């Protein structure tokens, strides 16, 4: 039916987030779908034309704009294996175990191809060189670079990273064979805010005197 399916949607932690739970980012949504779903769902197209689909997909914007929501929605909708990596989670571990977690993520995603590796908050594990204080940050950055570069040419694996600013990440991560394609998310316009209000104010028992259009018009910079 829908969402790869009352039982057909016509617990489950942070699941069931589909394309209908995102509003006002249709351009970025189209870009992300083109970058992710097509290489995984229909690999025969690229073999026919004779190109290698992109691997890395950087994605950035102000906090609260729905980067994690969008990545999780794409991962759940594609119906393909995926592996969550959280930057703070990886960096909160004894020395020599952050690299172990990164290697495990990439290797296990490779085992069950097609796969999507969502490196949430990548700016906390591969930060800007000036703020890479110590031999642990450098070591984890180098491990991530190794895994990103040596991944493969035939494997059907895609990597999605979320961050706040383009300059908050180590410059070495934005080269060829790495997070080359990047997507930018900005504050929504009036229609986007109206769609978000419609999404959130659906379970709420609203009174008849609600002018969601008025709220969308009044909320600027939200």
């Amino acid at each position: 039916g829908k969402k790869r399916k009352n039982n057909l949607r016509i617990e489950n932690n942070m699941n069931e987030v589909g394309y209908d739970d995102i509003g006002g980012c249709r351009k970025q949504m189209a870009q992300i779908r083109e970058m992710v779903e097509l290489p995984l769902r229909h690999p025969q197209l690229f073999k026919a034309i004779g190109i290698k689909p992109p691997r890395g997909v950087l994605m950035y914007g102000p906090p609260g704009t729905g980067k994690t929501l969008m990545a999780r929605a794409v991962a759940n909708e594609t119906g393909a294996f995926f592996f969550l990596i959280n930057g703070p989670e990886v960096m909160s571990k004894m020395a020599g175990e952050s690299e172990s977690n990164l290697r495990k993520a990439f290797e296990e995603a490779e085992k069950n191809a097609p796969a999507i590796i969502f490196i949430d908050e990548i700016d906390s594990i591969a930060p800007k060189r000036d703020k890479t204080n110590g031999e642990v940050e450098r070591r984890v950055v180098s491990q991530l670079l190794t895994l990103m570069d040596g991944m493969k040419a035939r494997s059907n694996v895609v990597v999605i990273a979320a961050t706040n600013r383009p300059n908050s990440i180590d410059p070495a991560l934005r080269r060829f064979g790495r997070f080359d394609r990047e997507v930018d998310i900005g504050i929504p316009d009036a229609t986007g805010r109206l769609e978000v209000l419609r999404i959130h104010t659906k379970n709420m028992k609203l009174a008849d005197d609600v002018d969601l259009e008025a709220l969308a018009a009044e909320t600027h910079g939200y």
Partner: protein, 474 residues
């Protein structure tokens, strides 16, 4: 791209290498993701996961899993290297041929051919994980030797290796029989000529290989009965005092060096022999429990360049000097204090040997009758060179042991009398039967299908002459 070299290794090693050993985990309650996918708490647990071992009370990581961890950590596929070999046994001997602009070590040396400081540290993996005795009689007879004579004993244990599911990618050495070389045991110790021992063991090993066995360890008894009326022994070896004295550690290291473990992931082609050592001393309550040990790969590489000797203190091993042949650097042994900090202490005079040991776990096959043993024996025909006692193999003992069954029939009775390891070795030494006759005899005594072979043997001319002379002899 070069890879592992082409070298034949044991079947057990191959079948272990085939497996992956991953430990699956179910959806944790801390997971935040749908059915498909996995974050950090649901991913399969590697076979070398330290948390799993320490949670299950396992003190070492089943060497094959250590190799898996090394391969996972290093040797990226399709690029990044040309397959640096992951395993390399330590070597402390000085480079006698450096010629970096200087003559050999005795009259010149540079910073390139100078052995660096050695840092002892407890080994984190063990080659063989379990040692299993097929029957209780095998060690009951070994201890009966001491019971009757009062002196100590020493013998090699023959058997074969196999898988062990109770540990991730673990190996168990199953021991079928024990052979005792000619040794002069004494009240406080034992002595044995090395040359006689090895000369005899060469042919004994040839015969055992023809039978399918292999030499996989040595076992000795350290028992001193207490004065109590019952049969009890002092608990000489325990936590605070020594487990294995320095001398036996050195001997075990020599034995391990002489039985290399052919491996496909090392430049030399061998790494950390699968040779175990067992000792019978007695547990904390006053029993005759048995314990098995194995010296680390650095003690194995330390004794080769001399550099160690026994000390008057049982628990500590001495260190030799920088003579004109052997060059010993400064040796540090690393330990962790109660505050979780590693501390390096120079030990030139002497250091404890607990940093040169890894402990195995012994056991016996479950009472369920699997009957995978190669011999229904170890109680009967006297054993090897026990001439000190009344156990003296000779034609009279054969006439009294293996003649009534051969004078009646009952092929089952004859088979269960013919399947004695030491009886087979003795009849081989008699040399009455020709090589083909003895080959069919061993395959009749050790193979689960023996009816036809047993009939052929008993009908064979050589066996007929043997039994005829045995009957005639008195």
């Amino acid at each position: 791209r070069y890879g592992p070299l082409r070298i034949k290794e044991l079947a057990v090693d191959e079948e272990l290498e085939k497996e992956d050993g991953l430990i699956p985990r179910q959806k944790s309650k801390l997971c935040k993701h749908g059915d498909r996918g996995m974050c950090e708490y649901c991913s399969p647990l590697p076979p070398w996961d330290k948390e799993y071992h320490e949670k299950n009370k396992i003190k070492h990581i089943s060497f094959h899993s250590y190799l898996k961890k090394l391969n996972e950590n290093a040797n990226k596929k399709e690029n990044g290297s040309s397959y640096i070999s992951p395993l390399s046994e330590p070597d402390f001997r000085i480079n006698k041929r450096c010629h970096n602009g200087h003559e050999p070590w005795p009259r010149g040396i540079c910073s390139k051919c100078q052995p660096s400081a050695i840092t002892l540290q407890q080994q984190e993996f063990r080659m063989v994980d379990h040692v299993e005795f097929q029957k209780s009689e095998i060690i009951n007879e070994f201890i009966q030797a001491w019971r009757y004579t009062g002196m100590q004993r020493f013998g090699y244990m023959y058997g074969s290796y196999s898988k062990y599911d109770n540990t991730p990618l673990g190996i168990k050495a199953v021991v079928e029989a024990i052979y005792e070389p000619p040794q002069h045991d004494e009240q406080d110790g034992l002595t044995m000529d090395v040359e006689q021992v090895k000369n005899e063991m060469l042919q004994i090993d040839r015969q055992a290989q023809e039978m399918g066995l292999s030499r996989i360890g040595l076992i000795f008894t350290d028992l001193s009965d207490a004065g109590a009326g019952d049969g009890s022994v002092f608990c000489k070896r325990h936590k605070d005092s020594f487990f294995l004295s320095s001398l036996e550690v050195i001997m075990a290291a020599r034995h391990q060096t002489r039985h290399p473990n052919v491996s496909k992931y090392s430049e030399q082609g061998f790494f950390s022999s699968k040779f175990v050592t067992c000792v019978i001393s007695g547990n904390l309550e006053g029993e005759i429990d048995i314990s098995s040990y194995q010296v680390s790969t650095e003690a194995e590489a330390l004794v080769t360049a001399d550099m160690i000797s026994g000390s008057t203190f049982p628990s500590m091993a001495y260190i030799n000097d920088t003579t004109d042949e052997r060059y010993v650097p400064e040796i540090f042994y690393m330990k962790s204090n109660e505050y979780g900090i590693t501390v390096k202490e120079n030990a030139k005079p002497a250091f404890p040997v607990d940093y040169l040991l890894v402990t195995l776990t012994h056991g016996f096959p479950n009472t369920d009758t699997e009957t995978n043993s190669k011999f229904v024996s170890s109680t009967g025909f006297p054993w090897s060179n026990r001439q000190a006692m009344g156990q003296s193999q000779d034609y009279q003992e054969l006439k009294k042991y293996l003649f009534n069954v051969a004078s009646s029939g009952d092929f089952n009775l004859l088979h269960e009398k013919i399947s004695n390891f030491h009886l087979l070795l003795y009849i081989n030494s008699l040399q009455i039967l020709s090589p083909d006759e003895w080959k069919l005899l061993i395959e009749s005594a050790v193979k689960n299908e023996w009816e036809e072979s047993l009939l052929k043997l008993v009908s064979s001319a050589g066996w007929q002459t043997l039994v005829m002379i045995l009957q005639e002899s008195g």
